[PDB]
């Protein structure tokens, strides 16, 4: 009978809500009211990167904090050198519709996808010297919204078929499949220890998955609309999700509930991309009002604004050393802020 | 030391990007949308994952993309198609059951914040099926406004009334709220659809340039 399962499911939901309320003895704002405000963080566009012909949806910094690969919808993955602004590589893609990209931790490989529903892995360390498609990972039924390398061999990718997939690049097949999401999975982020990862989807739910098992360890609710962005806290025990309800939301895994919501009345526009600084005190979030906001992760005060873009900011990422922030946009220009 | 080689590599990459820029600006991108019953498959097959078609008309290249490999949900990947010169929108004018679905989808595309600048080239296929249906299912049962509607085809004028009513519904959605709609009455077997897309894109780009050069 479906009705009894419905009753059991809503009873379990009420039990989870009651447990979260019982453990909600305080709030992050009340505890962090005594720490000094971060002040006004004025970030200037130290370097602006141009040659992308169409709007940029994807961007990922390298681990060396110098090279970054960015994907534009003209069918181009440009690997830059933000120190010198030189285009290290310009890979032409088979499918012009690219919605994600990744730079491997070793940096020998990059990845991409979008509507083609295929994760194209390209080799940047070819013996010949040119960049060619190392692999084409297919089985996704929908558009590939995000992809992140676990290492040279493994890659976890979220797609619009409401599932994620951990692939072995060498074999080219799904080592693991992650299902329970109800809507399109628009963004994921690997943990610092690269053991668990959170995926945000269009059903206003962020699911913390475990890689070695393949089952949803935790589910986080509180968002009001589609979650377009997600990133771990640098310590790995929390994450911030940006959504279409024009509010970011910081959740904690161990507490298993909302910690804080970052919003303002003047903001009525969705968040496209979210990242944390090296220490995690600043939550940089790109909005649709063509500007980004540097929220205080512990106070929620809008602690700066990055208003150098005249179109939608769709991707946003901070270097592993925290020396700079790249915020690609639909202008077709990246901008390295610092 | 290695800075010079990096500069030469950047120079080569920018030359390739300039060539790609000329190619990209030369061709015009189109987003073909419809439903399962809608005859967009025949349209894209006429001038022949994502089903792509390149067709050259009056030496202008048009790249039309039919995104059939995704799910029924399209509130996110549709944002991929704001750089398209136009959204080809295929509708079964002869299928009244699913015509309201087409109207809702057209309204959503029209009012989507990232598709506010994108003209919609509306192809009302199955005008022959619509004709035989009208001569033979009453549009009024699914559209009471048609009961009090007057015309603004050769076999009978009721077919004209029905097809222009559907056109007027779509144009009402278009005009009720920087981008225009270009409805067309096309049959399943027509060779002029490529020319229709050419003329509509000519008008769209003309209006874009007129806004650019400040005549509008």
């Amino acid at each position, epitope marked *: 009978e479906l009705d009894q399962l419905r009753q059991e499911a809503e009873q379990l939901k009420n039990q989870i809500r009651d447990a979260r309320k019982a453990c909600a003895d305080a709030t992050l704002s009340q505890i962090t009211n005594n720490i000094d405000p971060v002040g006004r963080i004025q970030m200037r566009t130290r370097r602006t990167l141009r040659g992308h012909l169409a709007k940029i949806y994807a961007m990922h910094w390298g681990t060396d904090s110098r090279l970054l690969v960015s994907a534009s919808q003209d069918g181009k993955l440009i690997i830059w050198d933000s120190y010198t602004t030189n285009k290290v590589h310009a890979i032409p893609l088979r499918s012009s519709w690219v919605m994600t990209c990744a730079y491997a931790p070793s940096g020998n490989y990059v990845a991409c996808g979008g509507l083609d529903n295929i994760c194209s892995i390209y080799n940047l360390k070819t013996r010949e010297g040119n960049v060619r498609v190392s692999r084409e990972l297919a089985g996704h039924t929908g558009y590939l919204s995000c992809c992140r390398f676990l290492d040279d061999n493994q890659i976890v990718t979220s797609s619009g078929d409401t599932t994620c997939a951990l692939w072995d690049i060498e074999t080219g097949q799904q080592t693991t499949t992650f299902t329970g999401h109800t809507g399109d999975v628009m963004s994921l982020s690997l943990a610092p220890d690269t053991r668990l990862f959170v995926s945000g989807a269009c059903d206003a739910s962020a699911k913390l998955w475990d890689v070695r098992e393949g089952m949803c360890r935790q589910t986080f609710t509180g968002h009001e609309s589609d979650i377009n962005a997600i990133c771990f806290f640098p310590n790995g025990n929390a994450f911030a999700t940006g959504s279409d309800d024009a509010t970011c939301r910081l959740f904690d895994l161990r507490a298993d509930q909302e910690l804080m919501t970052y919003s303002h009345d003047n903001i009525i526009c969705g968040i496209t991309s979210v990242s944390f600084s090296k220490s995690g005190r600043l939550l940089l979030a790109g909005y649709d009002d063509f500007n980004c906001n540097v929220w205080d992760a512990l106070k929620a005060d809008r602690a700066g604004v990055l208003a150098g873009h005249d179109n939608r900011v769709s991707c946003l990422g901070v270097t592993d050393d925290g020396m700079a922030v790249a915020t690609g946009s639909w202008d077709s220009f990246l901008k390295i802020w610092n | 030391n290695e800075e010079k080689a990096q500069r030469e590599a950047n120079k080569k990459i920018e030359k390739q990007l300039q060539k790609d820029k000329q190619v990209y600006r030369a061709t015009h991108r189109l987003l073909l949308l419809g439903a399962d019953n809608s005859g967009k498959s025949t349209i894209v097959k006429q001038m022949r994952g994502i089903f792509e078609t390149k067709f050259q008309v009056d030496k202008v290249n048009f790249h039309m993309f039919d995104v059939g490999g995704q799910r029924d949900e399209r509130r996110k990947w549709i944002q991929c198609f704001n750089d398209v010169t136009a959204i080809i929108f295929v509708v079964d004018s002869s299928d009244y059951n699913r015509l309201q679905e087409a109207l809702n989808l057209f309204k959503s595309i029209w009012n989507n*914040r990232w598709l506010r600048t994108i003209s919609v080239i509306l192809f009302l296929n199955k005008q022959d099926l619509l004709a035989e249906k009208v001569l033979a299912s009453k549009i009024e049962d699914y559209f009471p406004e048609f009961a009090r509607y007057t015309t603004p085809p050769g076999e009978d004028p009721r077919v004209t009334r029905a097809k222009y009513f559907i056109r007027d519904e779509f144009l009402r959605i278009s005009t009720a709220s920087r981008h225009y709609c270009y409805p067309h009455f096309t049959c399943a077997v027509d060779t002029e659809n490529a020319r229709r897309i050419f003329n509509d894109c000519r008008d769209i780009i003309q209006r874009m340039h007129l806004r650019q050069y400040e005549l509008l």
Partner: nanobody, 126 residues
Framework: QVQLQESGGGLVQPGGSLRLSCAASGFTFSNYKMNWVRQAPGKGLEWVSDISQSGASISYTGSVKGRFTISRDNAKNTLYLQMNSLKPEDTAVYYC?????????????????????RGQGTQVTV
């Protein structure tokens, strides 16, 4: 979490009246364009009506104009569909979809098979 509990559906004779009320929890009601949709037996999702944020703009499918009345109470945080002179063809499971994002006036994917922001629905039969 975005949750929508419909109620009111049950047996009602042809030509009768029936009130469907959806209680919405987990989101700011005033900022979303609220939709009523239906799925008949052996048929796909069919959009019935929608009402804007403030209730000023209201629209219905042509098959129910002059028969169905969609309204919203933001203060009480609920949606209503007053269904008058029911026909045999009006039998369906009625869901209360929601605009995917605010403050947009475009209701994408409301009639999708697996739309997330939709109540589980109430059966209505005559």
């Amino acid at each position: 979490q975005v949750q929508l509990q419909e109620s009111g559906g049950g047996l009602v004779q042809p030509g009768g009246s029936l009130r469907l009320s959806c209680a919405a929890s987990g989101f700011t009601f005033s900022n979303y364009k609220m939709n009523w949709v239906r799925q008949a037996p052996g048929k796909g999702l069919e959009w019935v009506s929608d009402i804007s944020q403030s209730g000023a703009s209201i629209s219905y499918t042509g098959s129910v104009k002059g028969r169905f009345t969609i309204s919203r109470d933001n203060a009480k945080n609920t949606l209503y569909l007053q269904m008058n002179s029911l026909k045999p063809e009006d039998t369906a499971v009625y869901y209360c979809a929601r605009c995917p994002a605010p403050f947009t006036r475009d209701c994408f994917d409301v009639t999708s098979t697996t739309y997330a922001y939709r109540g589980q629905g109430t059966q209505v039969t005559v």
